[PDB]
Design a protein around this ligand. Structure first.
Ligand code: YJ9
Length: 220
C-alpha cells in the first residue's frame, strides 16, 4: 500500500464540526464516511444531516444524543431509502421529532462493510476505499487535552471504545521515536481541538485505543 494517505487533499472530507452537548459522535462518524463514499461515486461533496440520523435512527438501535453505532446509521440510510443534506435538515445538538423529507435526500447506501479487526486490514481499506468510520477509546484526559503530535495513551483500551470518529489517512512521522506511525483521525469537537479538529493516533502499536476493533464503511 502507499506510505501515506490523506483523503482531505483529494476532496473527500467536509469541514470539522462541533457536536456540542449532544452525544452524537457516531452520527458525525457516519456522515463523514458516507460523504466520502458519495464523493467517490459521484464526484460531488455534500454535507449530510447528522440531525436526520439523531432524530430518525432509533428503530435501527440508535439512542440519539445518548449514543449510537455507525453501522446502525448506515442501516437506517439503507432502510429509509435516503438521508437529507445538512442544508435541508440542519444540526441542533438535541433530540427532536423525525422530519426526514425524501425529496431532499442527497445520499443512499446499500449496506456496509465491517473491516477485519486488524490494523493491516484497516490500512489497506483506508488506502483504497476512502475515509473509514472507527471506534476508539476517547475516555482519557490525555485525549480531552490533545493539542498536537502522535497520540499514545498507555491506559487506552482496545475493547472499551466509547467514541466514533473518522480515519481519513495514515503516515509515518520522522520524530526519531518509537511513536512514528499514525492514523489521521477527524474528530467532531470543533477546529479549535487538536490539530484543526484532527488527531494523529498511534498506528501499529497493538490496536491502540481499539481503532481497528470496529471499523466500517457504507457501500453505495
Ligand atoms: C459520542 N459522542 C458518544 N459515543 C458513542 O455513541 C459511541 C459510538 C460507538 S463506538 O464507536 O464507540 C463503537 C464501540 C463499539 C463497537 C462499535 C462502535 Cl461503532 C458506540 N458508542 C458508545 O459509547 C457505546 C454504545 C453507545 C450506544 C449504543 C446504542 F445502543 F446503539 F445506542 C451502543 C454502544 C458504548 C459503546 C458519547 C456518546
Amino acid at each position: 500500500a502507499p506510505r501515506s494517505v490523506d483523503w482531505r487533499e483529494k476532496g473527500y472530507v467536509t469541514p470539522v464540526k462541533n457536536q456540542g452537548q449532544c452525544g452524537s459522535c457516531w452520527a458525525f462518524s457516519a456522515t463523514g464516511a458516507l460523504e466520502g463514499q458519495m464523493f467517490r461515486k459521484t464526484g460531488r461533496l455534500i454535507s449530510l444531516s447528522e440531525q436526520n440520523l439523531v432524530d430518525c435512527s432509533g428503530p435501527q438501535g440508535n439512542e440519539g444524543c445518548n449514543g449510537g453505532l455507525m453501522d446502525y446509521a448506515f442501516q437506517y440510510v439503507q432502510d429509509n431509502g435516503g438521508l437529507d443534506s445538512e442544508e435541508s435538515y440542519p444540526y441542533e445538538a438535541t433530540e427532536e421529532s423525525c422530519k426526514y423529507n425524501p425529496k431532499y435526500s442527497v445520499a443512499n447506501d446499500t449496506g456496509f462493510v465491517d473491516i477485519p479487526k486488524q490494523e493491516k486490514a484497516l490500512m489497506k481499506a483506508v488506502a483504497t476505499v476512502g475515509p473509514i468510520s472507527v471506534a476508539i477509546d476517547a475516555g482519557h484526559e490525555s485525549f480531552l487535552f490533545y493539542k498536537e503530535g502522535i497520540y499514545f495513551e498507555p491506559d487506552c483500551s482496545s475493547e472499551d471504545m466509547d467514541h466514533g470518529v473518522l480515519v481519513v489517512g495514515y503516515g509515518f512521522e520522522s520524530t526519531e521515536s518509537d511513536n512514528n506511525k499514525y492514523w489521521l483521525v477527524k474528530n467532531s469537537w470543533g477546529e479549535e481541538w487538536g490539530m484543526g479538529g484532527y488527531v494523529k493516533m498511534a498506528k501499529d502499536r497493538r490496536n491502540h485505543c481499539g481503532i481497528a476493533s470496529a471499523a466500517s464503511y457504507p457501500t453505495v
